């Protein structure tokens, strides 16, 4: 259980993300925090990055909601980064219900290939989204 | 939260002290070896009890260190299992990892066994890599929460090299002075320890006489009065001449950049130089005007005008013309430093 | 004068900023050749520089006028342009009407600051332009 | 079309393979000379059949090399015909080409004939230019079709120097650590091959005694214990100083070029420093305020005015005044690094 | 107000001349020691009245210096009291100040007492810090009003290092030449003062034979002959090698940077090169056109043309083509870079 | 007009030939002095008529040089009177001008009068300043008419500095290679001439024995086997060390700038590196997807699955995870370096 | 006070800020000078700096009004502007209200350790006005 | 003569030029391709360079049409487009149809010099049909 001699660090870390006295994390505050480290993202990208922590949909992040993202501390292993970046590379911008017909082409032409009948089992494993229309879902395997 | 974070920080903290308890019990061995060798060089022979006790204290402090290393590696594997989802201790054993572990044990297992007592004592100056493991753990950049909060956006890696680069950048000069004055008393004991188990006498077998050869070889001078004879000195001279033919340029660059220039205070100096003699062209202008008036005044009046009074003023008139151009050159050139 | 073997140099020097070779130089070509070197003066400054090259006032310069301007041709550092350059430091707001007090102040406070017989002597030989204004024209005696 | 490209590719492949087949039969001729010389230097004499057999193998294997060079040049002329579109071999022979061909044959035709056996042996370290021809044909930059359409909009020429100045940029450091250690065993065999035909002993007649002189001459130290005597050593010690008084100024530049330390992490470091002790202005202000209030509370709100209890706080107030300015100076100075 | 500023200026002016009267009576004590030592080194002995007189003038003139230092410090304390509102000779004596005040008297109190007469005489080359105190007082930057009304808008402090780093900038080269030629006759008298009390001869007891060692050690050459054999020379050689292995990397930068050119005097050169052979492509174009017409005129127009008059033109038509591209490459380079 | 310019050009043309006729009759003297000294050293003595003839040809040919210098100065004065309105030989004789004229005559009027013959001969290597006067007259920049029109709007002065600073820039490297190899045979004859006049027979009495000392002193090595003994070699070694400890740092910059490329050439390389292996993100993604599908297909299906076939694929999955991040880091770094 | 030989320095220093003939200094002169130095301040900052020195509110500073600023010589260790500067860090929404909660937090949470009474007596005393909303005037006891 | 084991570099180069597979290689793709490397040209120059090879006139270059341009492989020293560059250097206005301008001077005073009477023979071919000058046409002999 966390104690009071190791919670001020997290409190001040949260304070860096909220200059004013409100307890709500705003997209404007993230915009101000960014654009000073070097990179300037689109406000749509800000919404995309900010809705990945929000749970109640209010558009603001509380300290308990921010702590579950602070939990993944500095080790840079596994996590939900690669499992989404691989899909983003494979898919297109806003692909959503991708055709997935070229899945065999992507698996064979690029990188090591599997058996011709092996990809049929992988294709048949996407029955969650009806028939076809492969999305970021069905990734509950990992 | 409970088994999330918390326990993780606790395991990290209990791992941290294992790399710190292996520094005292690693430098104690080196200190005792140095003291024992320096005392035995011209004193009690092997039959004395000192050569039996001080040569077993090292053999004990070299068993405790390799006892601690295994536990530290076990804690690292436990952190790997906690951080990355797995429940087997065989998953996290790659060829590289086991090779590095065996290499570490081999390097830390060298010690004289209670002649060859110098051959098995020279390579004990290899436990000096533990300072890196201590330093990468006793740093707030790698041990904080705000650091990771503001550094996760840029996916940088906190290796054992990023900390060193930051320490070089923010505190230069001193990190070179310590490195260049803590290497003399490591590479000058080695030369005499190598030439004393061999052809003796000379002058390299005397401390403060072997800090002259290393100081005029580190520095790229060389004289030739003292040259090593055995292969140990002949091999360490060009290893102290390589680290020192590219370490005397970094410090020169730092000296050149340190307090020999500034950025926001040069505006004041530029303004001062602009308001100084570069804006005293009025002097030359008045000189030219008064000279060209006086020439006419003393050539077209005063009855008969002597040639000397005319030619003196005319010669100084030709003197006072190029001065205006010379000052205007600097006036135009000063604006090139305001870009 | 110089034979045809020493006139092609002047012809190509003239053609350097003549370009189309229409026989007349315009402020457009002067700007084109001047902005290349780096300085960007006002077109009014271009008119001021182009006024003191021709006597007809047509606004264009022929080969003889350019030749008599180039007649300096190095090693001509004398009272040709310096005598005019050492006048803007005491110019009466570009009107050529410097007051006696301003002239006396410039003569006395700034420069050699000669004796009274040589400083108060500004009234002497000041009969040139006796109307009251002192323009650039009195340098004819020089 | 297809034929006009396939035929050209086939001719290119043949040219490449002939160029590659002249490296084995050129580097086999520099091994047998070394073995034969360093064997005959104190072993089986001329009467032994070895001194005839091994000296005949080199003179035989030097025939295949200059037989291959002519055919490779013939393939080059054929490719010139195909690319340009001429129907005469007399046309494509400029003075420069006919001079270079005979120069190449002359350089590659030197070999000991089955004393002068060192004079005709030292210049055989000249067939090392064939490495350039081998390397410029195995590079995908010069051998591809993707890097020929977009690489032609800039009309860049893919000669034998562009590849070298690209392999000096994308893989630096290693191209110097190979060049600095493949030249010692070329310029240290030469010294002992030159100082044995005329002189003898003189310390520098052993390989490990001649890799010391070159190492302290390459490095700009110089000692004076061993100096060459013949003109061969006295010239090679200078051709190893010229190449090496400007090669140690490149590796230092390369090793210091890592002072850039990226640009996406210096922003994070600057943010860390901004949130660090450069925000103790609050602490300094609190100190100033409390030390101002305490003086009044101690002098006016007390029955007895104690000098020792007011001058202490006042001098500490003077101490606290300049800390605020000293920290605001760094606060202002940190901004220009962000410009 | 008027009285405050006038009184402050008067106090400053009457404080200024104390550090100037402490320079004459400090540099007069370094001349008499040199004269007395280099006279007694082979002339009138201790029994002579000279060794009792000239050794007493120094011990007398060392009283006035430490008498003036106290008054100068009292003037500084008075200025501090006038500046900051306080009426007490105490308070202003901070812990650092009371130590820096005593260190100066300790350093300036060293003098031979009327062998040890060289031990107590070598460290008298320490009163050379007074030049800095004089120079920071005889600078118009630190003593004016324009560069205090406009120099305070950037909050810059005119300490004793800003003046030095400004003199190094506006007058470089000379500040290094004076420093590097006024140190020889300070570090070459020391060597012969150290090697005469213990050793003798060795051509290191002659001044012109000791300005050779420092010149070939400062430059980092070293020869091997004429090397010091005592602990004073063996240390001063190192202290003149360190200061001189990083002082010859600054004057080289200055000589390479000494106003090669600027934009104003390089735009003209760029225009000259643009109008020069970078714009003779008309020549190559005319060559190509004349050649391609002559080919037809000599092939078809001739009733019976020969090969020697048709390929002679073609083998230089191939020469006249790549020349156009070779000049267009330079044209593109000039038009792209060095605008 | 035409006359006012044609007459000036006529005087310029008839003046430029005097500084050219003063070069042949200036270098002929040096050649004859060298030949006469080298002949007299060990051959026909003073009694031979050669020592009276060749020592008189120099004394005769030194009359024409100082006769031509006066006429050249008269032409300069005539030009200075033609261009500026004045008619008097007394005006325009400033203090500097007459002093420079007498200094020139003094320097150019030293010759061995028909021992002291080596004292009065080594300062004859001072007529080498005439090369500058010839070069500033045989330059198109200072003599053409295309300039002075584009070169006058920037007020640049075409003195003897601008030509040198342009010749150092447009043709670098060669202006140092013809300066560092034309100084050896000037500074190595001087040492020989200085040490053959002191009845010395050291090793450095042969030309090839004195081109070794200068080559290992110019180069900052030094051995100590041969060192000069008189006060001439001691001092010319210093003046060849000073000029040469700051001349080897100027050619390294040039070679480093020549071992690089331009932006229009690096754009193609950046595009190639972008399209190269840094596009294996697809490969890594396919590898990760294949591995994560095999894990499930192997552990859930096929009756009962052994642990080995699961742990192998999971270990390879952990191997394949971090390659994607390692290549994304290079992607980001290349994007940062692209601008 | 100082004789005329020590007043020309001050006269030329004053003329440095005032290019034109009139002896009135305004916002334009300070703006030009500070922009020549390099910094870019807000016009309101210039108005505040001007209002700091003037005693009549006319908007112009005369030479007698400028002598009091010139009296502030180099004097590195000074105690005049530092007391003013060490107030913006505790400014309460620009108005500088300095509330009791803010003042107590500033005095206790950050700074030098002290007892609760020893850190709250000054707030409890409130020896500036006593009504509340302490302005900048509390530094009068100095 | 070509074989499938070597026809992949041309295909990947075509994919490099044409991002998406739709059969269009028009100004849109080439503009981005050129601007990626710099040296931003005028869209008129893009049209001029894109019509350098065409058979249908649709403005689209197919793979068979692109292969005849890819045939210009290495050994860039050839006799292709050098004549075009020379004519562009020696081009006047927009067509260069003037009566040889100074062609006689160019032939008889540049390089190795030609015959005075040879200019008539050189211009004898002319435009054949009497259409000004060659205009880069009538170069079958050349
Ligand atoms: Ca908020
Ligand atoms: Ca939420
Ligand atoms: Ca025109
Ligand atoms: Ca006109
Ligand atoms: Ca005003
Ligand atoms: Ca006012
Ligand atoms: Ca397309
Ligand atoms: Ca088409
Ligand atoms: K060196
Ligand atoms: K050296
Ligand atoms: K040496
Ligand atoms: K030596």
Bridge partners, A98 (sequence order) = A134
User: Using H for helix, E for strand and C for coil, what is the string for D33-64?
Assistant: HHHHHHHHCCCCCCCCCHHHHHHHHHHHHHHH
Q: Say which residues have a Cβ less than 8 Å from residue B305's Cβ, sequence separation at least 6.
A: B298, B299
A95 is in an annotated binding site: yes
Would you list the DSSP string of G112-128? S---HHHHHHHHHH--S
- The Cα–Cα gap between B285 and B289 comes to 6
Structure tokens given for B223 = 């004289």
Through-space distance between the first and last CA atoms of chain G, rounded to whole angstroms: 28
For the range B333-337, what are the long-range contacts, defined as Cβ-Cβ under 8 Å and sequence gap of 24 or more?
A: B333/E262, B333/E264, B334/B270, B334/B273, B334/B274, B334/B278, B336/E262, B336/E263, B336/E264, B337/B270
Q: Which of B223, B250, B264 sits opposite D256 (nearest CB)?
A: B250
φ, ψ for residue D125, nearest 5 deg: -80, 50
Provide CATH code, domain E264-336: 1.10.287.70
Q: Are the beta carbons of E186 and F186 closer than 8 angstroms? A: no
Q: Judge contact between E190 and E240, C-beta under 8 A.
A: no
Rounded alpha-carbon distances, angstroms, from residue F226 to A40, B208, B320, E224: 68, 30, 57, 11
Report how far apart the first and last C-alpha atoms of chain E are (Å, whole number): 57
Q: Which long-range contacts (CB under 8 A, 24 or more apart) does H14-22 make?
A: H14/H63, H14/H66, H16/D146, H16/D149, H16/D150, H16/F275, H17/D149, H17/D150, H17/H66
Distances (CA, A) of G104 to D316, D317, E83, G90: 22, 20, 33, 11
Decide: A and G in contact? Rule: 3+ Cβ pairs under 8 Å. no
Domain covering B171-261 assigned CATH 3.40.50.1820 in the classification: no
10 Å Cβ neighbour count for D108?
21
Overall fold of domain E171-260: Helix Hairpins (1.10.287)
E220 in Cβ contact with E65 (< 8 Å): no
What is the enclosing helix (H) or strand (E) of E50?
Answer: helix E50-83
Neighbours of chain H (3+ CB pairs under 8 A): D, E, F
> CB under 8 Å to G77, separation ≥6 — which residues?
D318, D321, D322, E80, E83, E84
SS3 call for E114: coil
Q: How far apart are the first and last CA of chain F?
A: 56
The structure tokens 């021809």 sit at D133
Q: Quick one: tokens of A86? A: 């691989």
Q: Which residues of D8-42 are buried (b: 16+ CB within 10 A; e: fewer)?
A: beebbeebbebbeebeebbeebeebbeebbeebee
Give CB contacts under 8 A, 24+ apart, made by H127-135: H131/H97, H132/H95, H132/H97, H133/H95, H133/H96, H133/H97, H133/H98, H133/H100, H134/H87, H135/H95, H135/H96, H135/H97
Give the max Cα distance, chain D: 121
Structure-token pair, residue D247: 């090669």
Instruction: Judge whether B319 and F94 are in contact, CB under 8 Å.
Output: yes
| Domain boundaries F178-260, CATH class | mainly alpha
Residue partners of E101: CB distance under 8 A and separation at least 6:
E73
Interatomic CA distance for residues A90 and A59, integer angstroms: 29
Closest by Cβ to E265, choosing from F154, F170, F249: F154
Contact, B214 vs E238, CB < 8 A?
no
d(C-alpha F339, C-alpha H72), whole Å = 32
Residues contacting H82, CB < 8 A, separation 6+: E288, E321, E324, E325
| CA pair distance D103, B321, nearest whole angstrom | 64
Nearby residues of A92 by Cβ (< 8 Å), 6 or more positions away? A98
Instruction: State which residues have CB under 5 angstroms from ligand 11, the bound ion.
Output: B 222; D 222; E 222; F 222
Distance CA B281, CA B290 (A): 14
Question: Quick check: B90 and F325 CB within 8 A?
Answer: no
Q: How many angstroms separate the CA atoms of D317 and D319, rounded? A: 5
Identify residues whose C-beta is under 5 A from ligand 12, the ion: B 224; D 224; E 224; F 224
Question: In CATH, what number does B266-337 get?
Answer: 1.10.287.70
For residue B101 the two structure tokens come to 């572990």
The CA distance from B327 to B322, in Å, is 9
Ligand nearest to the CA of D227: 12
| Contact state of F285 with A90 under an 8 Å Cβ cutoff | yes
Solved by what technique? cryo-EM
CATH architecture of F263-337: Orthogonal Bundle (1.10)
Which residue of C76, C77, C78, C86 to mutate against B (max B Cβ within 10 Å)? C86
**D146 and H12 in contact (C-beta within 8 Å)?**
yes
Please give the helix or strand (H or E) that residue F59 lies within, else none: helix F50-83
Question: DSSP states of E283-305 as a string?
Answer: HHHHHHHHHHHHHHHHHTSSSS-
Helix (H, G, I), strand (E, B) or coil at G61: strand
User: Coil, strand, or helix at residue B322?
Assistant: helix
Domains of chain G are 4-70 (1.10.238.10), 81-140 (1.10.238.10)
Phi, psi (rounded to 5 degrees) for H26: -75, -165
Find out whether E90 and D311 touch, Cβ atoms under 8 Å.
yes
Going from the C-alpha of F39 to that of each of A24, F34, F44, F54, the distances in angstroms are 101, 8, 7, 10
Taking the CA of residue F70 and the nearest CA in chain C, the distance in Å comes to 21
Phi/psi of residue A98, nearest 5 degrees? -70, 155
The answer to whether the beta carbons of residues E293 and E336 sit under 8 Å apart is no
- Chain E residue with minimal CA distance to H86? E285
Neighbours of E29 (CB within 10 A): 21
Q: Which ligand is nearest to the CA of B227?
A: 12
Percent helix, percent strand, percent coil in chain C, to nearest 5:
50, 0, 50
Read off the DSSP letter of residue B60: H
Gap between the Cα atoms of F15 and F10, Å rounded = 8
Report DSSP state, residue D126. Answer: T
Under 8 Å CB-to-CB from E84, ≥6 apart: which residues? Answer: D318, G77, G78, G79
Euclidean distance between CA atoms D128 and D136, whole angstroms: 14
Q: Which CATH class is domain D266-338?
A: mainly alpha
Helices F307-337, F281-299: inter-axial angle, 10-degree rounding: 160
Provide residues of F within 8 Å CB-CB of chain B. Answer: 84, 86, 88, 90-92, 94, 155, 220, 222-224, 311, 314-315, 318-319, 325, 328-329, 332
Dihedral angle over CA of E140, E144, E149, E150, nearest 10: -20
Task: Decide if B221 and E224 are in contact by the 8 Å CB cutoff.
Answer: no
Q: Is there an interface between E and C (3+ Cβ pairs < 8 A)?
A: yes
Residue E269: closest C-alpha in chain C = C37
Window 309-338 of F, Cβ < 8 Å to A: 318, 321-322, 324-325, 328
Contact check, Cβ <8 Å, E215/F238? yes
State whether A36 and D275 contact (CB < 8 Å).
no
**Total number of residues shown for chain B:** 339
Residues 6+ apart with CB under 8 A from E238: B215, B216, B219
Return the DSSP state at D199: -
Which contiguous run of DSSP H or E holds residue D98?
Answer: helix D95-108
Distances (CA, A) of H113 to B15, D260, E292: 89, 57, 14
Inter-chain CB proximity F264 and H39 less than 8 Å: yes
Within 8 A by CB and 6+ apart from E288, the residues are: E317, E320, E321, E324, H82, H83, H86
Q: Find, in chain G, the residue whose alpha carbon is nearest to that of E154.
A: G37
Query: What is the C-alpha to C-alpha distance for residues F84 and F72, in angstroms, rounded to an integer?
Result: 19
Contact G77 D322 (CB under 8 A): yes
Quick check: do B and F touch, 3+ CB pairs under 8 A? yes
Q: What share of chain F is helix, strand, coil (3-state, %, to 5)?
A: 70, 0, 30
Using DSSP, state whether A138 is helix, strand or coil. coil
CA A103 to ligand 7 centroid distance, Å: 23
8 A C-beta contact, residue E40 and residue E51: yes
Residues of chain G with Cβ-Cβ distance to D281 below 8 Å are 89
- Planar angle of CA E280, E283, E284, nearest 5 degrees: 100
> A134 by DSSP, 3-state: which?
strand
| Shortest alpha-carbon distance between residue F313 and chain A (Å) | 14
Residue of B nearest to A73 (CA): B148
- Within 8 A of C38 by CB-CB distance, chain E residues are 263-264, 267
Give residue F48's Cα distance to chain centre.
44
Fold (topology level) of D171-259: Helix Hairpins (1.10.287)
Task: Determine the Cα–Cα distance for residues B246 and B220; give it in Å rounded to an integer.
Answer: 11
Radius of gyration of chain D (CA): 36
């Amino acid at each position: 259980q966390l104690t009071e001699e190791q919670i001020a660090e997290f409190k001040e870390a949260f304070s860096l993300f909220d200059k004013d006295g409100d307890g709500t994390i705003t997209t404007k505050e993230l915009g101000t925090v960014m654009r000073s480290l070097g990179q300037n993202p689109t406000e749509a990208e800000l919404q995309d990055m900010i809705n990945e922590v929000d749970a109640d949909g209010n558009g603001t992040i509380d300290f308990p909601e921010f702590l579950t993202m602070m939990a993944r501390k500095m080790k840079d292993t596994d996590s939900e980064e690669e499992i989404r970046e691989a899909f983003r590379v494979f898919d297109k911008d806003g692909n959503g219900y991708i055709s997935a017909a070229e899945l065999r082409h992507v698996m064979t032409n690029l990188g090591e290939k599997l058996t011709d009948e092996e990809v049929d089992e992988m294709i048949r494993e996407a029955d969650i989204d009806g028939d076809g229309q492969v999305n970021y879902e069905e990734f509950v395997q990992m | 939260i409970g088994y999330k974070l918390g326990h993780r920080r606790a395991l990290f903290e209990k791992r941290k002290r294992l790399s710190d308890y292996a520094l005292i019990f690693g430098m104690f061995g080196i200190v005792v070896m140095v003291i024992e060798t320096e005392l035995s060089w011209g004193a009690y022979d092997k039959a004395s009890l000192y050569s039996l006790a001080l040569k077993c204290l090292i053999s004990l402090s070299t068993i405790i260190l390799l006892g601690l290393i295994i536990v530290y590696h076990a804690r690292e594997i436990q952190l790997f299992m906690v951080d990355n989802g797995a429940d087997d201790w065989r998953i996290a054993m790659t060829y590289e990892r086991i090779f590095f572990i065996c290499l570490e044990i081999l390097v830390c297992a060298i010690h004289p066994i209670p002649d060859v007592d110098i051959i098995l004592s020279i390579p004990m100056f290899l436990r000096l890599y533990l300072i890196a493991r201590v330093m990468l753990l006793h740093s707030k950049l790698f041990t904080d929460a705000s650091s990771r909060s503001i550094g996760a956006l840029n996916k940088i890696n906190f290796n054992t090299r990023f900390v060193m680069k930051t320490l070089m950048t923010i505190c230069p000069g001193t990190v070179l002075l310590v490195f260049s004055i803590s290497l003399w008393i490591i590479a000058a004991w080695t030369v005499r320890a190598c030439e004393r188990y061999h052809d003796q006498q000379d002058v390299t077998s005397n401390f403060l006489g072997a800090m002259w050869l290393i100081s005029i070889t580190f520095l790229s001078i060389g004289y030739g009065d003292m040259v090593p004879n055995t292969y140990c000195g002949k091999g360490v001279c060009l290893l102290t001449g390589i680290m020192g033919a590219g370490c005397t340029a970094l410090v020169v660059a730092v000296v050149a950049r340190k307090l020999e220039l500034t950025k926001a205070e040069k505006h004041v100096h530029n303004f001062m130089m602009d308001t100084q003699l570069t804006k005293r062209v009025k002097n030359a202008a008045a000189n030219v005007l008064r000279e060209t008036w006086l020439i006419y005044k003393n050539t077209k009046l005063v009855k008969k005008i002597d040639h000397a009074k005319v030619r003196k003023h005319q010669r100084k008139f030709l003197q006072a013309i190029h001065q205006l151009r010379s000052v205007k050159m600097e006036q135009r050139k000063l604006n090139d430093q305001a870009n």
